[PDB]
Amino acid sequence: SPPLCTLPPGPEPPRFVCYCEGEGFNLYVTDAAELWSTCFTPDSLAALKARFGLEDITPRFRAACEQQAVALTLQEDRASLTLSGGPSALAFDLSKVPGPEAAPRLRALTLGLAKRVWSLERRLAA
Say whether residue 110 binds its own copies (CB under 8 A).
Answer: yes
The only residue of 29, 79, 94, 109 in contact with its own copies, by rule CB under 8 A: 109
Say whether residue 16 binds its own copies (CB under 8 A).
Answer: yes
CB of 25 to its own copies, least distance (A): 20
Q: How far is CA 36 from the centre of its chain?
A: 9
Q: What is the DSSP letter of 105?
A: H
Long-range contacts from 102-110, C-beta under 8 angstroms, 24+ separation:
102/30, 102/34, 102/35, 105/28, 105/35, 106/30, 106/32, 106/35, 109/17, 109/19, 109/28, 109/30, 110/32
CB of 113 to its own copies, least distance (A): 4
Say whether residue 47 binds its own copies (CB under 8 A).
Answer: no
**Residues binding its own copies (CB under 8 A):** 1, 4-6, 13-17, 19, 30-33, 65, 103, 106-118, 120-121, 123-124
